[PDB]
Design an enzyme around this catalytic site. Structure first.
Site, mmCIF file in Angstrom:
data_model
loop_
_atom_site.group_PDB
_atom_site.id
_atom_site.type_symbol
_atom_site.label_atom_id
_atom_site.label_comp_id
_atom_site.label_asym_id
_atom_site.label_seq_id
_atom_site.Cartn_x
_atom_site.Cartn_y
_atom_site.Cartn_z
ATOM 1 N N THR B 126 0.850 -1.212 0.000
ATOM 2 C CA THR B 126 0.000 0.000 0.000
ATOM 3 C C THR B 126 0.874 1.247 0.000
ATOM 4 O O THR B 126 1.957 1.241 0.624
ATOM 5 C CB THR B 126 -0.905 0.029 1.233
ATOM 6 O OG1 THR B 126 -1.494 1.326 1.270
ATOM 7 C CG2 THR B 126 -0.179 -0.197 2.536
ATOM 8 N N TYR B 149 -1.744 1.161 10.614
ATOM 9 C CA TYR B 149 -2.049 0.329 9.424
ATOM 10 C C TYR B 149 -0.823 0.298 8.535
ATOM 11 O O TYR B 149 -0.329 -0.809 8.169
ATOM 12 C CB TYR B 149 -3.223 0.888 8.627
ATOM 13 C CG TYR B 149 -3.335 0.372 7.222
ATOM 14 C CD1 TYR B 149 -3.612 -0.970 6.987
ATOM 15 C CD2 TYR B 149 -3.223 1.223 6.122
ATOM 16 C CE1 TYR B 149 -3.754 -1.464 5.702
ATOM 17 C CE2 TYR B 149 -3.363 0.737 4.829
ATOM 18 C CZ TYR B 149 -3.629 -0.613 4.621
ATOM 19 O OH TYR B 149 -3.838 -1.126 3.375
HETATM 20 N N1 LIG Z 1 -8.524 -0.838 -1.499
HETATM 21 C C1 LIG Z 1 -7.501 0.015 -1.526
HETATM 22 O O1 LIG Z 1 -7.628 1.179 -1.879
HETATM 23 C C2 LIG Z 1 -6.098 -0.477 -1.223
HETATM 24 C C3 LIG Z 1 -4.995 0.398 -1.355
HETATM 25 C C4 LIG Z 1 -3.716 -0.034 -1.053
HETATM 26 C C5 LIG Z 1 -3.512 -1.366 -0.710
HETATM 27 N N2 LIG Z 1 -4.576 -2.228 -0.554
HETATM 28 C C6 LIG Z 1 -4.353 -3.631 -0.137
HETATM 29 O O2 LIG Z 1 -5.098 -4.423 -0.989
HETATM 30 C C7 LIG Z 1 -5.501 -5.637 -0.352
HETATM 31 C C8 LIG Z 1 -6.975 -5.849 -0.592
HETATM 32 O O3 LIG Z 1 -7.668 -4.723 -0.068
HETATM 33 P P1 LIG Z 1 -9.274 -4.644 -0.195
HETATM 34 O O4 LIG Z 1 -9.629 -3.198 -0.317
HETATM 35 O O5 LIG Z 1 -9.725 -5.581 -1.267
HETATM 36 O O6 LIG Z 1 -9.716 -5.156 1.255
HETATM 37 P P2 LIG Z 1 -10.892 -6.127 1.713
HETATM 38 O O7 LIG Z 1 -11.098 -6.057 3.178
HETATM 39 O O8 LIG Z 1 -12.039 -5.880 0.792
HETATM 40 O O9 LIG Z 1 -10.309 -7.565 1.323
HETATM 41 C C9 LIG Z 1 -9.342 -8.219 2.134
HETATM 42 C C10 LIG Z 1 -9.857 -9.584 2.496
HETATM 43 O O10 LIG Z 1 -8.889 -10.268 3.327
HETATM 44 C C11 LIG Z 1 -9.603 -11.193 4.110
HETATM 45 N N3 LIG Z 1 -8.764 -11.631 5.226
HETATM 46 C C12 LIG Z 1 -8.205 -10.836 6.185
HETATM 47 N N4 LIG Z 1 -7.549 -11.519 7.102
HETATM 48 C C13 LIG Z 1 -7.679 -12.836 6.715
HETATM 49 C C14 LIG Z 1 -7.216 -14.036 7.282
HETATM 50 N N5 LIG Z 1 -6.557 -14.114 8.440
HETATM 51 N N6 LIG Z 1 -7.533 -15.181 6.636
HETATM 52 C C15 LIG Z 1 -8.248 -15.111 5.503
HETATM 53 N N7 LIG Z 1 -8.740 -14.047 4.888
HETATM 54 C C16 LIG Z 1 -8.419 -12.918 5.555
HETATM 55 C C17 LIG Z 1 -10.852 -10.431 4.536
HETATM 56 O O11 LIG Z 1 -11.923 -11.251 4.943
HETATM 57 C C18 LIG Z 1 -11.170 -9.580 3.293
HETATM 58 O O12 LIG Z 1 -12.203 -10.109 2.472
HETATM 59 C C19 LIG Z 1 -5.071 -5.477 1.101
HETATM 60 O O13 LIG Z 1 -3.825 -6.126 1.311
HETATM 61 C C20 LIG Z 1 -4.864 -3.975 1.252
HETATM 62 O O14 LIG Z 1 -3.947 -3.671 2.294
HETATM 63 C C21 LIG Z 1 -5.865 -1.794 -0.834
#
Ligand SMILES: NC(=O)c1ccc[n+]([C@@H]2O[C@H](COP(=O)([O-])OP(=O)(O)OC[C@H]3O[C@@H](n4cnc5c(N)ncnc54)[C@H](O)[C@@H]3O)[C@@H](O)[C@H]2O)c1
Ligand SMILES: NC(=O)c1ccc[n+]([C@@H]2O[C@H](COP(=O)([O-])OP(=O)(O)OC[C@H]3O[C@@H](n4cnc5c(N)ncnc54)[C@H](O)[C@@H]3O)[C@@H](O)[C@H]2O)c1
Ligand SMILES: O=c1ccn([C@@H]2O[C@H](COP(=O)(O)OP(=O)(O)O)[C@@H](O)[C@H]2O)c(=O)[nH]1
Ligand SMILES: O=c1ccn([C@@H]2O[C@H](COP(=O)(O)OP(=O)(O)O)[C@@H](O)[C@H]2O)c(=O)[nH]1
Lengths: 314, 314
Positions: B126, B149
């Site tokens: 991120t 975070y």
């Molecule tokens: N959405 C954004 O703008 C953004 C920006 C930068 C980075 N990211 C990174 O992208 C990735 C996805 O983000 P997102 O927005 O889709 O988030 P999200 O919460 O929609 O999806 C993440 C998923 O991980 C699952 N998860 C968490 N811990 C778990 C565990 N112990 N076992 C199994 N499943 C588990 C959750 O249930 C969730 O569905 C993350 O790593 C986040 O840090 C997202």
């Protein structure tokens, strides 16, 4: 002033408490849960003199269970040394305690310091954050840890920066480089090698022994660490390396130990430990400028002091 | 090729699985524990659309409670997206789930991948690792997170480096910059502002609205993410920014949403949130070289697609 020292029963923490209590205007609160690599029997020995001092309060509690409101009440300065050290034991199932004691402990202390009026939060970190680097390392260099231990210590530093910038917690980060001397932990190289040589047992060398460290005698480390409290100049938000007088290889150290004991070491060469750099080497220009820090204890003198300590200990 | 996607039921992971399943050659295993900010009823819909496809296998388990050895035997590529996201809600007693799911989950996956034959371990990180800088940030810039975070995600990156150097796990790190579009998590700005504008409610703005983001449309993020698997170039060990076509402030986005809805909105200005950067701006030089990455979706097109999704969702 009232000073909290976390990990006060450890190697460096016990010495730091002793040095602060030389100033009659200082009161120290020490907290230590007696965990990590050092047996409780040795930690009891570390704090026996401290517990006699009427200006020392000792709390044998986990920082994650203790009443942090009670702990931090009217504290002026925090020295945060509590951690789980150790490169080898930081892999697989051994990692969780590093996360709990190096990351969660640091976050929960910083949270508790938000409404306190500290002069300073002096956070002790490690040359292990740097990983594998060439030349003398300065504090502006991009850290790439080589061990899970180093990762957890770097996460601690990063929490300090977060709480500094958001909540104005007056953090100062000291990065120590391999500290040795009396009360050194029994998992560190000089303690092991001296114990082995005293017992006429093989000296355990990880890899070929040509690896080098910036070894920092404990009294040098503590002079630098006390200078961080005592300075009146604004060092808030600074990262400062604290390094030693003389670098050396493990083979150079063993030769020096043989000169002290008049014995010849039996050497056992084991596999290299994953996660250990081949060299550490501090640039201490910044500590020289900000803290008037200059290490003065030679390895020959420091090693005799540790040799004597270990002999007496066992 | 058989591909494990962690966090498959989430915003970005469900889109990633969708894109991989378009290639008949690819078999996809999704694992998701249904935790984090998004209510489980929205993630059920994500998994239901994927489960239309015979080449998709879903596992509803915590990564910390599954036989990773058994799961990974036939896996060629891991995409690791599972995390707890949320700059704003990582403080005080909310922090421990970030440590458990962002740090311990990453370490335990990397541990299980030590003796697996993987083509690639593609770790999603991120822009929140950087904190605050003047212009577009390069992957070689010293990262100092502004939020807990951000600290936890940077610790995951560092665990990747440790396992790559010590156990030759073929890691690739992708740093995403604020991703938006259909299926965006309900806690993110565009979802909230669009929902508020659709329901003629005050648009909630945290601070003065002059914060700016390198907003990345979901289809652009997924094209760069699939290119990390498919690229002709060697990217093992590389950190690669994945950013967007156009930067904007929240005030700028609101004017663009007014254009789309054909409404004038009521603004509700609230307190700035501690731990958020003021600006994010990716240097995507490296992604262009290594992945042939070029974002193509304008803010006007992307916001219209998200607007349509939100209008249909409620
Ligand atoms: N959405 C954004 O703008 C953004 C920006 C930068 C980075 N990211 C990174 O992208 C990735 C996805 O983000 P997102 O927005 O889709 O988030 P999200 O919460 O929609 O999806 C993440 C998923 O991980 C699952 N998860 C968490 N811990 C778990 C565990 N112990 N076992 C199994 N499943 C588990 C959750 O249930 C969730 O569905 C993350 O790593 C986040 O840090 C997202
Ligand atoms: N010794 C070195 O060479 C060296 C080098 C670099 C950095 N450091 C750092 O210096 C500090 C002190 O190291 P040391 O060698 O004195 O180690 P040590 O193990 O002797 O002392 C640390 C103490 O922290 C205590 N502690 C740990 N977790 C705790 C918790 N949850 N609650 C309460 N007490 C807890 C332990 O009981 C222990 O006595 C550490 O932060 C270490 O990372 C030391
Ligand atoms: O019994 C030992 C213990 C350690 N070492 C090595 O000695 C060096 C210094 O380790 P020490 O534990 O003093 O400090 P570190 O640098 O790990 O903080 C490291 O390169 C270890 O590989 C060794 O050769 N034999
Ligand atoms: O209801 C909201 C939600 C978020 N934001 C702001 O919008 C920006 C983008 O937040 P988002 O959650 O989209 O992404 P982030 O950059 O946190 O990943 C941040 O500056 C938030 O402070 C806002 O003004 N109102």
């Amino acid at each position: 002033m009232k000073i909290l020292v976390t990990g006060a029963a450890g190697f460096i923490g016990s010495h730091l408490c002793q040095a602060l209590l030389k100033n009659s205007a200082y009161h120290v609160v020490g907290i230590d849960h007696f965990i990590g690599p050092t047996p409780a029997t040795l930690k009891t020995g570390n704090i026996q003199s401290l517990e006699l001092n009427s200006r020392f309060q000792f709390i044998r509690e986990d920082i994650l269970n203790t009443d942090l409101s009670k702990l931090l009440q009217d504290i002026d300065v925090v020295y945060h040394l509590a951690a789980i050290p150790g490169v080898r034991t930081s892999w697989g199932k051994d990692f969780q305690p590093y996360v709990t004691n190096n990351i969660m402990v640091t976050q929960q202390l910083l949270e508790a310091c938000k409404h306190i009026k500290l002069d300073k939060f002096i956070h002790i970190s490690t040359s292990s954050v740097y990983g594998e680097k060439s030349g003398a390392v300065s504090e502006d260099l991009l850290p790439i840890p080589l061990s899970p231990y180093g990762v957890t210590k770097l996460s601690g530093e990063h929490l300090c920066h977060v709480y500094h910038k958001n909540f104005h917690i007056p953090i100062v980060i000291l990065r120590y480089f391999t500290v040795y001397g009396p009360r050194q932990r029994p998992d560190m190289a000089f303690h092991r090698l001296i114990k082995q040589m005293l017992e006429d047992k093989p000296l355990t060398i990880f890899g070929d022994g040509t690896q080098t460290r910036d070894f920092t005698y404990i009294d040098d480390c503590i002079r630098g660490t006390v200078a961080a409290l005592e300075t009146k100049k604004n060092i808030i938000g600074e990262v400062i390396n604290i390094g030693g007088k003389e670098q050396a290889s493990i083979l150079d150290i063993i030769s020096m130990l043989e000169k002290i004991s008049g014995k010849s070491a039996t050497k056992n060469f084991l596999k290299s430990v994953p996660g250990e750099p081949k060299q550490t080497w501090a640039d201490i220009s910044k500590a020289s400028t900000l803290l008037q820090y200059s290490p003065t204890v030679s390895l020959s003198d420091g090693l005799e002091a540790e040799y004597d300590y270990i002999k007496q200990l066992y």
